[PDB]
Structure formats: structure tokens, C-alpha cells
Design an enzyme around this catalytic site. Structure first.
Site, PDB file in Angstrom:
ATOM      1  CD  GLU A  64      13.910   0.884  -1.306  1.00 18.94           C
ATOM      2  OE1 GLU A  64      13.724   0.904  -0.078  1.00 18.94           O
ATOM      3  OE2 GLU A  64      14.911   0.321  -1.812  1.00 18.94           O
ATOM      4  CG  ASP A  92      15.387   5.401  -1.056  1.00 17.35           C
ATOM      5  OD1 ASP A  92      15.366   4.164  -0.999  1.00 17.35           O
ATOM      6  OD2 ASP A  92      15.602   6.143  -0.073  1.00 17.35           O
ATOM      7  CE  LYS A 118      17.642   7.348   5.877  1.00 19.70           C
ATOM      8  NZ  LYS A 118      18.238   6.073   5.383  1.00 19.70           N
TER       9      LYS A 118
HETATM   10  C1  QQ4 Z   1      -1.704   1.205 -11.802  1.00 17.14           C
HETATM   11  C2  QQ4 Z   1      -1.267   1.930 -10.524  1.00 17.14           C
HETATM   12  C3  QQ4 Z   1      -0.020   1.266  -9.918  1.00 17.14           C
HETATM   13  C4  QQ4 Z   1       1.000   2.347  -9.550  1.00 17.14           C
HETATM   14  C5  QQ4 Z   1       2.388   1.724  -9.320  1.00 17.14           C
HETATM   15  C6  QQ4 Z   1       3.516   2.740  -9.048  1.00 17.14           C
HETATM   16  C7  QQ4 Z   1       4.796   2.066  -8.501  1.00 17.14           C
HETATM   17  C8  QQ4 Z   1       5.820   1.498  -9.524  1.00 17.14           C
HETATM   18  C9  QQ4 Z   1       5.794  -0.048  -9.438  1.00 17.14           C
HETATM   19  C10 QQ4 Z   1       6.913  -0.960 -10.032  1.00 17.14           C
HETATM   20  C11 QQ4 Z   1       6.489  -1.463 -11.440  1.00 17.14           C
HETATM   21  C12 QQ4 Z   1       7.608  -1.876 -12.406  1.00 17.14           C
HETATM   22  N1  QQ4 Z   1       8.000  -3.258 -12.207  1.00 17.14           N
HETATM   23  C13 QQ4 Z   1       7.144  -4.341 -11.704  1.00 17.14           C
HETATM   24  C14 QQ4 Z   1       8.090  -5.463 -11.288  1.00 17.14           C
HETATM   25  C15 QQ4 Z   1       9.316  -5.284 -12.156  1.00 17.14           C
HETATM   26  C16 QQ4 Z   1       9.327  -3.800 -12.498  1.00 17.14           C
HETATM   27  O1  QQ4 Z   1      10.250  -3.172 -12.917  1.00 17.14           O
HETATM   28  N2  QQ4 Z   1       8.309  -0.479  -9.895  1.00 17.14           N
HETATM   29  C17 QQ4 Z   1       9.229  -0.970  -8.871  1.00 17.14           C
HETATM   30  C18 QQ4 Z   1      10.639  -0.538  -9.250  1.00 17.14           C
HETATM   31  C19 QQ4 Z   1      10.459   0.644 -10.177  1.00 17.14           C
HETATM   32  C20 QQ4 Z   1       9.028   0.513 -10.704  1.00 17.14           C
HETATM   33  O2  QQ4 Z   1       8.587   1.115 -11.628  1.00 17.14           O
HETATM   34  N3  QQ4 Z   1       5.574   2.035 -10.856  1.00 17.14           N
HETATM   35  C21 QQ4 Z   1       6.211   3.248 -11.355  1.00 17.14           C
HETATM   36  C22 QQ4 Z   1       5.909   3.359 -12.854  1.00 17.14           C
HETATM   37  C23 QQ4 Z   1       4.750   2.400 -13.113  1.00 17.14           C
HETATM   38  C24 QQ4 Z   1       4.686   1.500 -11.883  1.00 17.14           C
HETATM   39  O3  QQ4 Z   1       4.008   0.524 -11.792  1.00 17.14           O
HETATM   40  N4  QQ4 Z   1       3.060   3.825  -8.166  1.00 17.14           N
HETATM   41  C25 QQ4 Z   1       3.296   5.254  -8.468  1.00 17.14           C
HETATM   42  C26 QQ4 Z   1       2.326   6.033  -7.575  1.00 17.14           C
HETATM   43  C27 QQ4 Z   1       2.088   5.155  -6.367  1.00 17.14           C
HETATM   44  C28 QQ4 Z   1       2.322   3.738  -6.874  1.00 17.14           C
HETATM   45  O4  QQ4 Z   1       1.951   2.757  -6.306  1.00 17.14           O
HETATM   46  N5  QQ4 Z   1       1.048   3.370 -10.590  1.00 17.14           N
HETATM   47  C29 QQ4 Z   1       1.642   3.222 -11.951  1.00 17.14           C
HETATM   48  C30 QQ4 Z   1       1.921   4.663 -12.397  1.00 17.14           C
HETATM   49  C31 QQ4 Z   1       0.811   5.453 -11.788  1.00 17.14           C
HETATM   50  C32 QQ4 Z   1       0.535   4.755 -10.487  1.00 17.14           C
HETATM   51  O5  QQ4 Z   1      -0.011   5.245  -9.549  1.00 17.14           O
HETATM   52  N6  QQ4 Z   1      -2.356   1.982  -9.563  1.00 17.14           N
HETATM   53  C33 QQ4 Z   1      -3.636   1.271  -9.676  1.00 17.14           C
HETATM   54  C34 QQ4 Z   1      -4.595   1.970  -8.714  1.00 17.14           C
HETATM   55  C35 QQ4 Z   1      -3.696   2.532  -7.631  1.00 17.14           C
HETATM   56  C36 QQ4 Z   1      -2.354   2.763  -8.326  1.00 17.14           C
HETATM   57  O6  QQ4 Z   1      -1.472   3.452  -7.930  1.00 17.14           O
HETATM   58 MN    MN Z   2      15.370   5.383   1.932  1.00 19.47          MN
HETATM   59 MN    MN Z   3      16.461   2.393  -0.025  1.00 19.24          MN
END
Ligand code: QQ4
Ligand code: MN
Ligand code: MN
Ligand code: QZM
Length: 178
Positions: A64, A92, A118
Site C-alpha cells: 500500500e 496492503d 472484505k
Molecule cells: C522518518 C519517519 C518516517 C516514517 C515513514 C514510514 C512509512 C514508509 C514510507 C514510504 C517511504 C518509501 N518511499 C518514498 C516514496 C517512494 C518510496 O518507495 N513507503 C511507501 C511505500 C512503502 C514505503 O516504504 N516507510 C517504511 C520504511 C521507511 C519509510 O519511510 N512509517 C513507518 C511507521 C509510521 C510511518 O509513517 N518512518 C520510517 C521508518 C520508521 C518510521 O517511523 N518519521 C519521522 C518522524 C515520524 C516518523 O514516523
Molecule cells: Mn486495505
Molecule cells: Mn489497499
């Protein structure tokens, strides 16, 4: 803009908002109009991300929040290298530990009703399902909840906080009607 859109912007972190806008535009909806769907998309995205965070380091692949073509590409790679059958609808997550796709749902009704909906929609049998509600309940296939209690509890608490913030802005009621 509207009050719901301003709330969405102060409630979720900006990267979640950006991915929600992207996903909604890819299906021709406008975040600034269909604001309830905007909030729902943000909530669903955040829940998927908290969930993937709940595991061990390499545990989940996140489907997702990718554009549809790249999401199906990643699904194809997972299928072709694990031999798991290709789902009919984009899931997802993928659980590399349990070897299964996961569909995540967030509902403003009874987890029972949305789970049944679902699970009737999926029918590909092996895609695990995990439902959360805005009242703190959850329901999962084979009563197998994938993650430890504490990660699920954190998700449930966040959902209830979103509920309260919306209520304080008198947006919860119409939100709950969709
Ligand atoms: C630093 C941290 C940010 C969060 C972000 C993370 C969500 C997710 C985001 C993206 C990035 C990868 N992209 C970008 C565009 C192309 C592409 O492929 N996508 C989307 C598709 C799959 C994926 O990976 N991920 C997962 C791994 C790293 C990352 O960025 N998560 C996870 C918890 C809630 C949240 O929001 N992270 C990073 C890991 C720890 C964390 O919490 N911060 C700053 C303060 C608050 C906060 O949470
Ligand atoms: Mn879903
Ligand atoms: Mn979905
Ligand atoms: C058709 O519009 C949308 C479609 C999509 C892609 C397919 N659908 C989902 O990926 C999906 N979406 C939701 C929400 C709560 C956003 N809406 C809903 O389907 O219910 N919940 C889920 O569990 C779920 O898998 C993305 C964004 C949308 O706005």
C-alpha cells in the site's frame, strides 16, 4: 478548502497526506472535494504503516502507498519468488514470516460486518485479513493477529484519538456516515 481538509492536514503527517492525495487522484477523486474519503485514505495509510512497523526488520513488504503499477509489480515479484498465488485485488502488505498477503481494513461499524464484506470480496482464500475499528476492536483470519498485542494496541489507541479529534471538530458524525 474545507474544515475536514484542514483537519486532515493537521492530523496526519505530511508524507501520509501526499500519498493519500496521489492514491485518490489515481482514481479520479479530488481530496479537496471528497474529504471523507480523504480522511479514510489517510487513516488506512497510517494504519498500514504502523502495522508494517510492528514486525521484525525485514518482516513485511509494503504494497500500500505505491502507485498501482508498481504495487502490482511488487506483488508479481513476491508471487514469482515465493510461489504464492496472485491475488485478484491488491493487498496492503506481504508477510515474509507467515508467507501470506494481508488486507487491512479500518471500519466505523462492526468489525464483524466489514470483515464479512472484505472476505466475500477476496475469495482468493489465502490472503490474510485484519480489521480494526475506531472503537478498539479488531478481528483477524484464523484469529491469528500476526503481531504482538502491544503493536495492535498502539494502532487501536491512534484510531480512537483520530475519532476524538474529529468529534471535537464536529466532523465525526458525517465521517461515520460513509
Ligand atoms: C522518518 C519517519 C518516517 C516514517 C515513514 C514510514 C512509512 C514508509 C514510507 C514510504 C517511504 C518509501 N518511499 C518514498 C516514496 C517512494 C518510496 O518507495 N513507503 C511507501 C511505500 C512503502 C514505503 O516504504 N516507510 C517504511 C520504511 C521507511 C519509510 O519511510 N512509517 C513507518 C511507521 C509510521 C510511518 O509513517 N518512518 C520510517 C521508518 C520508521 C518510521 O517511523 N518519521 C519521522 C518522524 C515520524 C516518523 O514516523
Ligand atoms: Mn486495505
Ligand atoms: Mn489497499
Ligand atoms: C476506490 O478508491 C480508492 C482505491 C484505492 C485502491 C484500492 N482500494 C484500497 O486499496 C483500500 N482502500 C480503503 C479505503 C478506506 C481508502 N477505502 C475503501 O476501499 O474502503 N481501505 C482498504 O482496506 C483498501 O484496501 C485506494 C484509495 C482509494 O480512495
Amino acid at each position: 478548502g474545507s474544515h475536514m481538509e484542514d483537519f486532515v492536514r493537521q492530523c496526519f503527517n505530511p508524507m501520509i497526506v501526499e500519498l493519500a492525495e496521489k492514491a485518490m487522484k489515481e482514481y479520479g477523486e479530488d481530496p479537496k472535494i471528497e474529504t471523507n474519503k480523504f480522511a479514510a485514505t489517510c487513516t488506512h495509510l497510517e494504519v498500514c504503516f504502523m502495522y508494517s512497523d510492528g514486525g521484525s526488520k525485514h518482516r513485511f513488504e509494503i504494497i500500500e502507498g505505491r502507485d498501482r503499477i508498481m504495487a502490482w509489480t511488487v506483488v508479481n515479484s513476491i508471487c514469482n519468488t515465493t510461489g504464492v498465488e496472485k491475488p485478484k485485488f491488491l493487498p496492503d502488505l506481504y508477510d515474509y514470516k507467515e508467507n501470506r498477503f494481508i488486507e487491512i481494513g479500518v471500519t466505523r461499524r462492526e468489525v464483524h460486518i466489514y470483515y464479512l464484506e472484505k472476505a466475500n470480496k477476496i475469495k482468493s482464500e489465502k490472503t490474510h485479513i485484519h480489521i480494526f475499528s475506531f472503537t478498539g476492536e479488531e478481528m483477524a483470519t484464523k484469529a491469528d493477529y500476526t503481531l504482538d498485542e502491544e503493536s495492535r494496541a498502539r494502532i487501536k489507541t491512534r484510531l480512537f484519538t483520530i475519532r476524538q479529534e474529529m468529534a471535537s471538530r464536529s466532523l465525526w458524525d458525517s465521517f461515520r456516515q460513509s
